[PDB]
């Protein structure tokens, strides 16, 4: 109409559950449908922004208002709406009531938005990071942003000033220029402070585990995954439950979440499996456990292929151990009865890899 | 008197028909050769010697001794002037219409071997001799004792060797020590005279006692897997068998005698076997199961390795099964043989197939 729908939304109940949370799913789509039509007019854009369920005067108290737009960018929605959303939050956070709460939990989504292909979106997330950075020079949605939990390992003060001032703000311009430059920049940052790399690292990783946005997981992972270790803690040591969650869900379940965000299941499989580092005993065990349990085939494939890629940098003795398991796996009575593809995939690992003298003696002696 | 004492001592020695490229006439050859190396520097002593009655000019070709002596001297660890002297003595001895009735083709291997010589003087002297041999069967069953030229060249095949490959690349081979082997390879790579030349060359390589000539000729023969249905392996296998038969003593000794290296031989002998040769690879496995010199062992396995990528699809499986079979052999395991270790080195170095791996697992 579009005011008839605007009035339908007028009589709507404000809430505190975030949009990045389970309970508010049915609400979000409804609002989001309207936003996709309202965002073409600055007039209707304000109409929408203003209806009381969004609760502009309740962000930062509420965690609803910002969460809605976070989710609208980083979502399978056309460019002008991702821009519009980034702007609604950009201008809304300059208002003054907002200089007492922290809002660090937005940076994952800005970081994500800077990997976006649309030039206008990268510039919009750039501007938004600038405003977020001017702020300090406590925590918004600290435990409610995804419903049950929020920002799991918060960012330290020195780590925050290092995130903004050392890694985030200096790379904005080239990040607007090169759709790829963000992952490169963020990796080259966490590989400027010694313990700030660690706190930024943990912070990013936790948000990657906890969001429902597969898209955010991927974009953050394009960079986060290409970091083997930082001061005694491996990225696997931080992200392994992401792998256990993703592996556990059915083919339906994965196809369905992926469809909802219009992302490709294989890309997720690859990204999830890339969480495990070479000489990580527990990550390897998780791999072997997960393949013994019934799982999506593309995931099975992705896991074994990862074991292969991991093989060259596997140390000598864990190489032997991985061959022992692969062998025993070929020899397992239950999988043999199933004639599962686990056998064939395992033998393919044993082909494609460069074996060692010791492994060969294992093969000979039984 | 330059050499009168020695020449009178050689006078009293009785000529024989057992050839120099044969077994028994060893100390005799050594003796004659020692004197020759000193006699070859003076034309006076060269002629005194050439004439000595035990050499038995002009009884060659009645007697296979005279020509075999100088043959053995080109292809020996002897100074340049002595090899040239021998090449010249045979050229001169053979332009003499005394010999226009016998066929001296059994000399061509030794010329070919001689044109690979580094010293240019030797190369051109062998050039002279190839041309003189070209203007025109000697020792056919005698040159090496029990056998001679085991597979000879027909009329068309011999004229093909002379006019087609030898004499046209002759001058460039005198300039370049390399152009000989190259010329012969690019020659066997006419038909099917190629095959008769091939058999002929190989027969002399198997049969000669001159490891140096075996090598020099193999530098070429080994560069040819097959031509018109016959594998070089099928022709050279008894060489491999003989050579594997030798003790470390005998190989080091024979090698010393000609001043060639046991390893270079190990290499050339083993490359005799082409990849997809059932009987040759089978021979390898038999030989390694028997006692052999380690250098040969290393070389045999090293060869199986190199041969692997060209092993046919199924033959990879069968031979990997065989290698495995060796590693599990209890008698060798008690010996803690180096065969086991070299086999596992093969099974490591090689790209396996799913079928081979399943063989390993179901083991």
Residue numbers in the entry:
A (entry chain B): 17 to 153, 160 to 213, 228 to 402
B (entry chain A): 16 to 151, 161 to 213, 229 to 402
Give verbatim excerpts from the published study on this entry.
The 5' region of pre-rRNA that consists of the 5' external transcribed spacer (5' ETS), 18S rRNA and the internal transcribed spacer 1 (ITS1) is co-transcriptionally packed into a terminal ball of ~40 nm in size. These particles represent the earliest assembly intermediates of 40S and are known as the 90S pre-ribosome or the SSU processome. Within 90S, the pre-rRNA is cleaved at sites A0 and A1 in the 5' ETS and site A2 in the ITS1, yielding a 20S pre-rRNA intermediate. The fully assembled 90S contains an unprocessed pre-18S rRNA, U3 snoRNA, approximately 51 assembly factors and 18 r-proteins with a molecular mass of 5.0 megadaltons.
The EM densities were docked with the available crystal structures of yeast 40S ribosome and AFs or homology models of AFs. Utp10 is a large protein (1769 residues) with mostly α-helices by prediction. In the EM map, the M domain is continued by an elongated density that should correspond to the C-terminal region (C domain) of Utp10. In addition, the UTPA protein Utp10 adopts an extended superhelical structure pointing upwards, forming the large arch. The WD domain of Utp5 contacts the WD domain of Utp4 and the M domain of Utp10. The exposed H1 lies over the tandem WD domains of Utp17 and contacts the CTD of Utp9 by its base and the M domain of Utp10 by its tip.
